[PDB]
C-alpha cells in the first residue's frame, strides 16, 4: 500500500544520502585508513553495505 511504498522509497532516499555523505567525506581525504585495506576498499565496502542494508 501507499504508506509502505512511501516508507520504502524514503528508506532508499536516506541510503542514497548516506552514500553521498560518505562519498563527499572520502573526496576531502577525511577517511581513516583502517589497517589492512586501502581507502577505496573501505569506501566501496561502506557503500555496498549501506545499499544492502537499505534493500533488506
Amino acid at each position: 500500500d501507499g504508506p509502505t511504498m512511501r516508507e520504502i522509497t524514503e528508506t532508499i532516499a536516506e541510503a542514497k544520502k548516506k552514500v553521498l555523505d560518505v562519498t563527499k567525506e572520502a573526496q576531502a581525504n577525511l577517511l581513516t585508513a583502517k589497517h589492512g585495506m586501502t581507502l577505496r576498499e573501505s569506501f566501496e565496502d561502506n557503500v555496498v553495505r549501506f545499499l544492502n542494508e537499505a534493500r533488506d
Binding site: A28, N29, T38, R40
Partner: protein, 118 residues
C-alpha cells in the same frame, strides 16, 4: 631530476667526480665534452608519486562533454564555471580526491582538506 646532453653529439652525459676540487662534472663518452653540474641531485626514485594525478590538462578541457561540471567557485577568479575529475594516476592506493579546473582562468584547485600543496 634533470638531464643534459653533449651539445655536439646530443648523447646523454654521465656523472664524474673532480676529486682534487670535490666538484661534480657531467662528461660525454662520444666526444671529449665535459660540463659543470648545476645541481647536486643525480638520481631520484619516487615510490609514492603525486605526478600525473593532474595529467592531461589542456585548454580545450572545456570541450570534453564526458567531464562533469561542479558548482564550486574558483579560489582565484570566483567563476563557478569549472570541471573536475579524480586522480588520473592509476595506482590502487590512490586518494579519491577531486581536481577542479576553472573554465575561466585555467586554474587547477582541489577538494582536499588534509593538505594543500602546489
Amino acid at each position: 631530476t634533470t638531464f643534459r646532453f653533449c651539445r655536439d653529439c646530443n648523447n646523454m652525459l654521465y656523472p664524474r667526480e673532480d676529486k682534487e676540487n670535490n666538484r661534480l662534472l657531467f662528461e660525454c663518452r662520444t666526444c671529449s665534452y665535459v660540463e659543470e653540474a648545476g645541481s647536486p641531485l643525480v638520481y631520484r626514485h619516487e615510490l609514492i608519486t603525486n605526478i600525473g594525478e593532474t595529467a592531461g590538462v589542456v585548454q580545450d578541457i572545456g570541450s570534453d562533454p564526458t567531464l562533469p561540471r561542479s558548482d564550486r567557485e574558483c579560489p582565484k577568479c570566483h567563476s563557478r564555471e569549472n570541471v573536475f575529475f579524480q586522480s588520473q594516476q592509476r595506482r590502487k592506493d590512490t586518494s579519491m580526491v577531486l581536481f577542479f579546473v576553472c573554465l575561466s582562468c585555467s586554474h587547477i584547485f582541489t577538494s582536499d582538506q588534509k593538505n594543500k600543496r602546489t
